[PDB]
């Protein structure tokens, strides 16, 4: 519920010692957390937001040249000069022409020449930047209350949201019923601002990093304009033509907007038409759920006569979702729900919406289950009206495990070392695992930086060839430690 | 699939890659046929009008 | 003296009348009346429902 | 009980409004006003002139 039908769910099992679990959660996915004797909750980061932006440097896109003046001089008599040349709002470049008696000069040589133009901008690109504080996240918290119209209905009163700020980052959620959940984020070690420039076009907005933003050949001016008129690298957007070694001329270059849209190939788009709402990134959030009860214990098993008002209809990575309607007596009650089979009776199939509860009897309650990899049966009622429904699930035996492995390597490729903080404190293995992933990531960094889609594939096959044709059993280390990994990363980049 | 007055029960992937000018199922006003070139041909016999 | 044009390219365009249409899974493709006229630019993609 | 159509293949059709347009060599390829519709099936080919 609020997690159903989103194609990225990432079920989190169990809890370790004191009742806390460690999850990383991002904008694309939403996390379903299952515990032993605790309700299952659904977590979803919905809104990253920068709050106080301060502009760093603004580029120009389309400019305009007026007041073109020029000045030449005799060939041996040095170099020309203008008082417009020392003005910073004029662009100049020395060259030379041919001079003689036809040019009214004498001495028949190559005289110098200057040319000016008043560089005037009319389309800016304000690159704003923010600090890691006042960066206010927002996470919705929602339980698996078996409750009408709530499975994917991502609106309304179907959950409680809390907001995370890096100077006050506990802010527990008193969600109705079920007790009260706490969580301990770490948003400072997330996307790592002070290295991120919120670039801004007229209406569109991007999210680029600093050193790319500072190295663009395009005329610039600092964050305070105040009759700016002092564009710095003006030569990148004018060009001076000297045809035939006769007179020379100055022309502007034109609109750099579409070339800038080609420049941003690999920049995640955000919006800042109102606010500075990012919709990308993640944060490592330690979910600490101590005082989280069930809302429905000490109820009684039902009398019977359930009926189904919406069919089985399994989700992706199949977990079925059935909506049932109760009629009868004893209206607060526990639904006798169980996934099992035919004769020589066993039980097989986990229940995800733990302890489903009928309240306010004339209101349907939607239960979600988890069937096994073959054929199974769905039993709901008890003595009369034994609601027995069939369901068949394709494959789900080895394709589930290799699909879990591919989600694990993809989650470990998109997120860095933080993907090791997705489990419930493995102790030594998680810590040395992310320690070796920090060392191997820092050595994988300061390499493959600026390398694109095809180039790390090419360097991957030319390092895998060296891996195959080596000696001294350096084969496996140079093959599987760097080679095949850079192949896989070469495939999975450019999301 | 249902032709004029008969009917058959065919495979799906066999049905989708069937070379004929098709149209989506939710398409009212069925004018925008898609691969129309599988039911027309262009006679350019010599180097003259086609 | 007398030039004849060969091919006209676009430089700066604009998109008005943004229309979209989606349909439930495992039941074909969406159909839309503006796919017929070729001023409209189109692309099919996959949402999850 | 309740079917959902996903694709409509056609069987028999007909072609009306047959129009053509050519253009002198090396000055590009022609253009016709009803090429803009996707009812009109089109093909470009070379004639000698």
């Amino acid at each position, epitope marked *: 519920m609020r997690c159903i039908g989103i194609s990225n769910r990432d079920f989190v099992e169990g809890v370790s010692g004191g009742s806390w679990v460690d999850i990383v959660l991002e904008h694309g996915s939403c996390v379903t957390t299952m515990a032993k004797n605790k309700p299952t909750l659904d977590f979803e980061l919905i*809104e990253t937001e920068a709050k106080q932006p301060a502009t760093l440097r603004k580029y120009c896109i389309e400019a305009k040249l007026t007041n073109t003046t020029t000045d030449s001089r005799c060939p041996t008599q040095g170099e020309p000069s203008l008082n417009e040349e020392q003005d910073k709002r004029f662009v100049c470049k020395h060259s030379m022409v041919d001079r003689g008696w036809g040019n009214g000069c004498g001495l028949f040589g190559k005289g110098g020449i200057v040319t000016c133009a008043m560089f005037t901008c009319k389309k800016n690109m304000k690159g704003k930047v923010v600090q890691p504080e006042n960066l206010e996240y927002t996470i919705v918290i929602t339980p698996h209350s078996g409750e009408e119209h709530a499975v994917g209905n991502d609106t309304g009163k179907h959950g409680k949201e809390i907001k995370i700020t890096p100077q006050s980052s506990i802010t527990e959620a008193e969600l109705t019923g079920y007790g009260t959940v706490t969580m301990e984020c770490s948003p400072r070690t997330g996307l790592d601002f002070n290295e991120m420039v919120l670039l801004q076009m007229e209406n569109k907005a991007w999210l680029v990093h600093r050193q790319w933003f500072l190295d663009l050949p395009l005329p610039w001016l600092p964050g305070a304009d105040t009759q700016g008129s002092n564009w710095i690298q003006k030569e990148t957007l004018v060009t001076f033509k000297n045809p035939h070694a006769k007179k020379q001329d100055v022309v502007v270059l034109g609109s750099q907007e579409g070339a800038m849209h080609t420049a941003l190939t690999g920049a995640t788009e955000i919006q800042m038409s109102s606010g500075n709402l990012l919709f990308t990134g993640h944060l490592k959030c330690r979910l600490r759920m101590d005082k989280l009860q069930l809302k429905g214990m000490s109820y009684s098993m039902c009398t019977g006569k359930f009926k189904v008002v919406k069919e089985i209809a399994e989700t992706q990575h199949g977990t079925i979702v059935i909506r049932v309607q109760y009629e009868g007596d004893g209206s607060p009650c526990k639904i006798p729900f169980e996934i099992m089979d035919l004769e020589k009776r066993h039980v097989l199939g986990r229940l995800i919406t733990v302890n489903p509860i009928v309240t306010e009897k004339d209101s349907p309650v939607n239960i979600e289950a988890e069937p096994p990899f073959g054929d199974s049966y769905i039993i709901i009622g008890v003595e009369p009206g034994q609601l027995k429904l069939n369901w068949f699930k394709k494959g789900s035996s080895i394709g589930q495990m290799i699909e879990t492995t591919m989600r694990g390597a993809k989650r470990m490729a998109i997120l860095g070392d933080t993907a090791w903080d997705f489990g419930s404190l493995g102790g030594v293995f998680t810590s040395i695992g992310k320690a070796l992933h920090q060392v191997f990531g820092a050595i994988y960094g300061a390499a493959f930086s600026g390398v694109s889609w095809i180039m790390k594939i090419l360097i991957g096959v030319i390092i895998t060839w060296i891996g195959m044709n080596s000696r001294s059993t350096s084969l496996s280390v140079s093959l599987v430690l760097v080679g095949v990994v850079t192949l896989y990363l070469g495939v999975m980049v450019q999301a | 699939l249902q032709m004029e007055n008969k009917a058959w029960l065919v495979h799906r992937q066999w049905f989708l890659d069937l070379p004929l000018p098709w149209l989506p199922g939710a398409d009212t006003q069925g004018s925008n046929w898609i691969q129309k070139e599988t039911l027309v041909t262009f006679k350019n016999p010599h180097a003259k009008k086609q | 003296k007398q030039p004849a044009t060969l091919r006209k390219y676009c430089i700066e365009a604009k998109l008005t009348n943004t229309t979209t249409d989606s349909r439930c899974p495992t039941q074909g493709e969406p159909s839309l009346n503006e796919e017929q006229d070729k001023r409209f630019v189109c692309k099919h993609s996959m949402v999850d429902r | *009980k309740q079917p959902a159509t996903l694709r409509k293949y056609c069987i028999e059709a007909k072609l009306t409004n047959t129009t053509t347009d050519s253009r002198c060599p090396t000055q590009g390829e022609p253009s016709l006003n009803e090429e803009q519709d996707k009812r009109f099936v089109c093909k470009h080919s070379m004639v000698d002139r």
Partner: antibody
Framework: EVQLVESGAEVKKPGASVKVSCKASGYTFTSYAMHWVRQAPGQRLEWMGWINAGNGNTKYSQKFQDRVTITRDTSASTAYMELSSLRSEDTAIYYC?????????????????????WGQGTLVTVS | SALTQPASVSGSPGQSITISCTGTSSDVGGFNYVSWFQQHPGKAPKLMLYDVTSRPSGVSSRFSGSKSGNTASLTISGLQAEDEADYYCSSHTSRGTWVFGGGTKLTVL
């Protein structure tokens, strides 16, 4: 707790433009869509509907696509209805219709319910 | 692009009435976005149904709906005197627009 009041009009003339408004109370304005529904006397309830949001990106109608535009403002929490080029059949009872926006700011799909709460209706007439 | 629920139906108090509504495959034949309304003649139309079988808070369990393809049927079991009002259907098309029904006038006496 959720109340939607509106602003009525007495009588209009064909060739003019009418501007009916509506105040939203009990809930915030930034994450809620607010549609528009006709009701001609003894006729089908036609759809003026405007998918407003906190940003203002709004789809037209289909019958009335190039005939009517609207405005809005957040500080007054009022969605307007500027019906231009009035005719003889444009007399109806206009309703404002509450609707809920997705939590990602955009309005791609509407919710499972549409119209939990309504305006009282403004019976406009032409003359 | 319009819904075709009939003109008027009637039934004695104690019986059950059925109100049907047929539409295209773009709003009701594929999607579950079907809802119902209670337009009293001196009141704004009140929301009586959510999604095809669902129901708002405050609405009694007397009202129930169904869908059998292109047809969405509304069933009122055990009519009373407080049902003498119009009933308007609704559907969200795949295009993005909403269409409403013509209107059924219900009488019990």
């Amino acid at each position: 707790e959720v109340q939607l009041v509106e602003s009525g009009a007495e009588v209009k003339k064909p060739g003019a433009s009418v501007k009916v408004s509506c105040k939203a109370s009990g809930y915030t304005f930034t994450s809620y869509a607010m549609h528009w529904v006709r009701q001609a006397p003894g006729q089908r309830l036609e759809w003026m509907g405007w998918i407003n949001a906190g940003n203002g990106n709004t789809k037209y109608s289909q019958k009335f696509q190039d005939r009517v535009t609207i405005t809005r403002d957040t500080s007054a929490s009022t969605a307007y209805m500027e019906l231009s080029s009035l005719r003889s059949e444009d007399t109806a009872i206009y309703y404002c219709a509450r609707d809920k926006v997705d939590d990602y700011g955009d309005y791609w799909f509407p919710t499972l319910w549409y119209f939990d709460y309504w305006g009282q209706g403004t019976l406009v007439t032409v003359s | 692009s319009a819904l075709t629920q009939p003109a008027s139906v009637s039934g004695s108090p104690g019986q059950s009435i059925t109100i049907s509504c047929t539409g295209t495959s773009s709003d009701v034949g594929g999607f579950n976005y079907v809802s119902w309304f209670q337009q009293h003649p001196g009141k704004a139309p009140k929301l009586m149904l959510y999604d095809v079988t669902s129901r708002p808070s405050g609405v009694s369990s007397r009202f129930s709906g169904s869908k059998s393809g292109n047809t969405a049927s509304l069933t009122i079991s055990g009519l009373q005197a407080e049902d003498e009002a119009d009933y308007y259907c609704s559907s969200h098309t795949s295009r993005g627009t909403w269409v409403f029904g013509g209107g059924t006038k219900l009488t019990v006496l």
